[PDB]
Design a protein around this ligand. Structure first.
Ligand SMILES: [Mg+2]
Ligand SMILES: [Mg+2]
Ligand SMILES: [Mg+2]
Ligand SMILES: [Mg+2]
Ligand SMILES: [Mg+2]
Ligand SMILES: [Mg+2]
Ligand SMILES: [Mg+2]
Ligand SMILES: [Mg+2]
Ligand SMILES: [Mg+2]
Ligand SMILES: [Mg+2]
Ligand SMILES: [Mg+2]
Ligand SMILES: [Mg+2]
Ligand SMILES: [Mg+2]
Ligand SMILES: [Mg+2]
Ligand SMILES: [Mg+2]
Ligand SMILES: [Mg+2]
Ligand SMILES: [Mg+2]
Ligand SMILES: [Mg+2]
Ligand SMILES: [Mg+2]
Ligand SMILES: [Mg+2]
Ligand SMILES: [Mg+2]
Ligand SMILES: [Mg+2]
Ligand SMILES: [Mg+2]
Ligand SMILES: [Mg+2]
Ligand SMILES: [Mg+2]
Ligand SMILES: [Mg+2]
Ligand SMILES: [Mg+2]
Ligand SMILES: [Mg+2]
Ligand SMILES: [Mg+2]
Ligand SMILES: [Mg+2]
Ligand SMILES: [Mg+2]
Ligand SMILES: [Mg+2]
Ligand SMILES: [Mg+2]
Ligand SMILES: [Mg+2]
Ligand SMILES: [Mg+2]
Ligand SMILES: [Mg+2]
Ligand SMILES: [Mg+2]
Ligand SMILES: [Mg+2]
Ligand SMILES: [Mg+2]
Ligand SMILES: [Mg+2]
Ligand SMILES: [Mg+2]
Ligand SMILES: [Mg+2]
Ligand SMILES: [Mg+2]
Ligand SMILES: [Mg+2]
Ligand SMILES: [Mg+2]
Lengths: 115, 109, 55, 102, 150, 141
RNA sequence: UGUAACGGGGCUAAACCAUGCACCGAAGCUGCGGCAGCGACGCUUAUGCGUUGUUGGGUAGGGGAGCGUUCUGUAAGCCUGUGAAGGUGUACUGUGAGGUAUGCUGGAGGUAUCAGAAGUGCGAAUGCUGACAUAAGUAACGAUAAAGCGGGUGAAAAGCCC
RNA sequence: CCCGGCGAGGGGAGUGAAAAAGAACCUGAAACCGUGUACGUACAAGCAGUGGGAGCAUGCUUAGGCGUGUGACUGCGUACC
């Protein structure tokens, strides 16, 4: 028996165009172009789930290095000082304590000074 | 009242008429009627007739009151084209489109 | 001769920006009859500067 | 009053009273949990570790929601090598409300 | 397809895509690459497979209790009014009546009745026995089927 | 949780003065580019112009080691048919002593709108005098 | 074509040779989840596993398990003017093909389940047909024999009539 | 009836259950061209996305948190067959 394939096409195109919804020019409107944009977007989305973790880790270290040199220590010594006193606090939090509770960040720099 | 009036299958193109439309928007009917009198385009005569329609249209049927009438939502929409075959040199044929436009106007207050 | 690959709605818009023809916004008023007309042109009935100069 | 603790292989800087999301646990939906994995307690006296953990620093929390996250789509695609691979993911979470810090 | 052999346009020269037919499947009108022919869809079933299946489905009706065995079952005259009423006393509805001694009276007045289907014991079927909810067999009919299948 | 990104409106900036008499160009221009960017501050963000305003004065008195007073060339094209103008570190100090520090900072800053924004911060002067006493700019070293 | 033979700034250390201790740095490795593929077995029995070890980049290609479409059977059953299909949105849900429920439009059909059969799924073939873009309101308006003014007609006249 | 050239076309009134069923007439997708509304956009370079992300425009229950749209600036990033 014959199968008209008109209902199903638009179903699977509309799925894709709805993902491209937002893109500039044809990349939004036109299926052929959108399909590529949607896939490349996926590739990048996958690729940057990895880079998200790196970028933030740089960004924290920068904050900590800045915050330490206010108190008079370079990051490399500050981390080695913390690790030598078996301190387990990660970068993410150190970058938060750097910004927020500077009285608490000061005491970490003393805690690290011992070693 | 919103009081619409329009010309469908208007024999001038969309882009040419849409150029005149620009001169009438948020504008007082009395002021807009004058402009189109002293604008020199074919589309001016075309769009005037539709506006001058819309005012009588508005005053007779529903709204009354000619003084307070501002042209709100005038817009031109590309209508059904008509394909004619202009022959070119060396035996090749070219489909020239005799384009048309739908001209709507909304005269409210 | 010929395009490499097609322009957009945007560019085509950008180009057409200047095609917007200006209005008159400068209608005269004839002194005697009070009719509106183009400056330095006669009126449609047949006046210019408050004097009939046409059949 | 705020404190720092590890749970889902990663730390969380939490205050007494507020809610926080963390990686899934094997606990009931409306049941308390006691973390003895505290790394820092900030107050007037900023208590810190010279060892693994403080000394007698407990964190009581109350489990609220046991939900699944937002969908994350995964498109592995090689160009000109006739290969694509669609895939999806909704990572689990546990949401907890902090009652007290000791 | 009803069309010319003629190459619509020559191979090269023109900028169009090389063709040699207006009957080719990739053109609107004329094609269908793999057009089906009238074909015999029926298949072989082994005697013993068929018999074994009828035995197997006819054995299951004893456990289901769909099979109703009866004595001298025959309507008085060719009238649906009697047959329709006599199923209420026996307390049935959607049936397959099977008889050895095929009475015409019983057949005539069961064409228009849809949930009833009358057969001869010779003409029992696989799908027929399975499809209908109840089944009605005469003691002669079961004697004939028993002896036929063996 | 998320990390604290800086928010322009809340950014309390500071003004500084830098005497460039007897300083090494690169060693100065680095230390400027660190500040202008705002990495010395603890609330640093790589998409926000957190860094401070600096007034470098006595730009003509800047020092350079070796033979770079003569040998350091400053090539720049004119965007024209074959116009490749050059200038030695002497000739640059004779003409425009501000340019020297400005280029050496501009090279060390990032490219892009934020990069150009954090250069506008820098204010270079040939003379010891400056006209920004209204800001009370603190002496930086 | 332009510095153009450190990637740039720039550097007398920010170059080099040697010793030491730091740190940064990958989808490597460990941490906490979640999935699948195998092979041992506690002895359960047709399987959860108390587990255990393990693997899981992939073209040609080989091998598994599925989604969906139209059609036929269960079906004179079941859902539908107290709103079907189609169109269009939204909110959930599944590892994926996809599903589920519902507001608008539409105004009459639809089809569970498990089977069966295919004209069964398209972005490319200078594919085929239709529609609509682009250049573009651009070139051109077909002979360099030439028009001008008045009056008429008519809504309107360089082009019609006198 | 009304505007209009005793036109084309339209608007009211009226038939009908419905006239965005009015002869192009069931449904009415897409490309394509429009009109309003929100944000962005005239010192900024490049497969135009993606990860971050202030601002701004907006809805909910609460007296504090969430969602949708836009996306300044910024790391990475040379389409598909
Ligand atoms: Mg059919
Ligand atoms: Mg889909
Ligand atoms: Mg010819
Ligand atoms: Mg090309
Ligand atoms: Mg293009
Ligand atoms: Mg443009
Ligand atoms: Mg060609
Ligand atoms: Mg055919
Ligand atoms: Mg075929
Ligand atoms: Mg640069
Ligand atoms: Mg040269
Ligand atoms: Mg150079
Ligand atoms: Mg390390
Ligand atoms: Mg594999
Ligand atoms: Mg591997
Ligand atoms: Mg069916
Ligand atoms: Mg159907
Ligand atoms: Mg359906
Ligand atoms: Mg289903
Ligand atoms: Mg099954
Ligand atoms: Mg096919
Ligand atoms: Mg197609
Ligand atoms: Mg293909
Ligand atoms: Mg070609
Ligand atoms: Mg072509
Ligand atoms: Mg065609
Ligand atoms: Mg065209
Ligand atoms: Mg041109
Ligand atoms: Mg030209
Ligand atoms: Mg021309
Ligand atoms: Mg010509
Ligand atoms: Mg000519
Ligand atoms: Mg004349
Ligand atoms: Mg002439
Ligand atoms: Mg002429
Ligand atoms: Mg007439
Ligand atoms: Mg309607
Ligand atoms: Mg039509
Ligand atoms: Mg109908
Ligand atoms: Mg229609
Ligand atoms: Mg447009
Ligand atoms: Mg600007
Ligand atoms: Mg560019
Ligand atoms: Mg550009
Ligand atoms: Mg880049």
């Amino acid at each position: 028996a014959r199968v008209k394939r008109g209902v199903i096409a638009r179903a699977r195109h509309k799925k894709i165009l709805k993902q491209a919804k937002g893109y500039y020019g044809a990349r939004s409107r036109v299926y052929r172009v959108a399909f590529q944009a949607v896939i490349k977007a996926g590739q990048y989305a996958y690729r940057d789930r990895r880079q998200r973790k790196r970028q933030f880790r740089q960004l924290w270290i920068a904050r900590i290095n800045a915050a330490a040199r206010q108190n008079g220590i370079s990051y490399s010594k500050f981390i080695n000082g913390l690790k030598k006193a078996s301190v387990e606090i990660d970068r993410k939090i150190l970058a938060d304590i750097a910004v927020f509770d500077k009285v608490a960040f000061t005491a970490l720099v003393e805690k690290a000074k011992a070693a | 009242m919103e009081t619409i009036a329009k010309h469908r299958h208007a024999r001038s193109s969309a882009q040419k008429v849409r150029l005149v439309a620009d001169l009438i928007r948020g504008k007082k009917v009395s002021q807009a009627l004058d402009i189109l009198t002293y604008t020199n385009k074919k589309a001016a005569v075309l769009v005037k007739k539709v506006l001058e329609s819309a005012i009588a249209n508005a005053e007779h049927n529903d709204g009354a009151d000619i003084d307070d009438l501002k042209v709100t939502k005038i817009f031109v929409d590309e209508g059904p084209s008509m394909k004619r075959i202009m022959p070119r040199a060396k035996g090749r044929a070219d489909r020239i489109l005799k384009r048309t436009s739908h001209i709507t106007v909304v005269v409210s207050d | 001769a010929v395009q490499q690959n097609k322009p957009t709605r945007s560019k085509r818009g950008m180009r057409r920006s200047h095609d917007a023809l200006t209005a008159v916004t400068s209608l005269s008023v004839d002194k005697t009859s009070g009719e509106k007309h183009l400056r330095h042109h006669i009126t449609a009935d047949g006046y210019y500067r408050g004097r009939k100069v046409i059949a | 009053m705020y404190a720092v603790f590890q749970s889902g292989g990663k730390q969380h800087r939490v205050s007494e009273g507020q809610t926080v999301r963390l990686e899934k646990l094997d606990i009931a939906t409306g049941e308390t949990v006691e973390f003895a994995e505290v790394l820092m307690i900030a107050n007037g006296e900023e208590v810190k570790i010279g060892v693994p953990f403080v000394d007698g620093g407990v964190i009581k929390a109350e489990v609220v929601a046991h939900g699944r996250g937002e969908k994350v789509k995964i498109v592995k695609f090689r160009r000109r090598k006739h290969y694509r691979k669609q895939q999806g993911h909704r990572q689990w979470f546990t949401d907890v409300k902090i009652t007290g810090i000791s | 397809v009803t069309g010319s052999g003629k190459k619509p346009w020559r191979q090269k020269g023109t900028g169009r895509a090389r063709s040699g037919s207006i009957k080719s499947p990739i053109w609107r009108s004329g094609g269908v690459t793999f057009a089906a022919r009238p074909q015999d869809h029926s298949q072989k079933v082994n005697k013993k497979m068929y018999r074994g299946a009828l035995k197997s489905i006819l054995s299951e009706l004893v456990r289901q209790d769909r099979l109703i065995v009866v004595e001298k079952f025959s309507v008085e005259a060719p009238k649906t009014k009697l047959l329709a009423q006599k199923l209420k006393d026996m307390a049935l509805e959607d049936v397959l009546i099977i008889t050895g001694e095929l009475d015409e009276n019983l057949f005539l007045a069961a064409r228009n009745l849809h949930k009833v289907d009358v057969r001869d014991a010779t003409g029992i079927d696989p799908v027929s026995l399975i499809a209908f909810d109840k089944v009605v067999m005469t003691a002669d009919a079961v004697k004939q089927v028993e002896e036929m299948l063996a | 949780m998320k990390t604290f990104t800086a928010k322009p409106e809340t950014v309390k900036r500071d003004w500084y003065v830098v005497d460039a008499t007897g300083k090494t160009l690169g060693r100065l221009a680095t230390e400027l580019a660190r500040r202008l960017r705002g990495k010395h501050k603890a609330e640093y963000t790589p998409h926000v112009d957190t860094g401070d305003y600096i007034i470098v004065l006595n730009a003509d008195k800047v020092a350079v080691t070796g033979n770079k007073r003569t040998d350091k060339v400053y090539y720049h094209h004119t965007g024209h048919i074959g116009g490749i103008k050059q200038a030695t570190f002497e000739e640059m100090i004779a003409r425009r002593p501000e340019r020297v520090i400005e280029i050496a900072v501009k090279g060390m800053l990032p490219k892009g709108p934020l990069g150009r924004a954090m250069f506008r911060k820098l204010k270079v002067y040939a003379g010891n005098e400056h006209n920004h006493a209204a800001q009370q700019p603190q002496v930086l070293d």
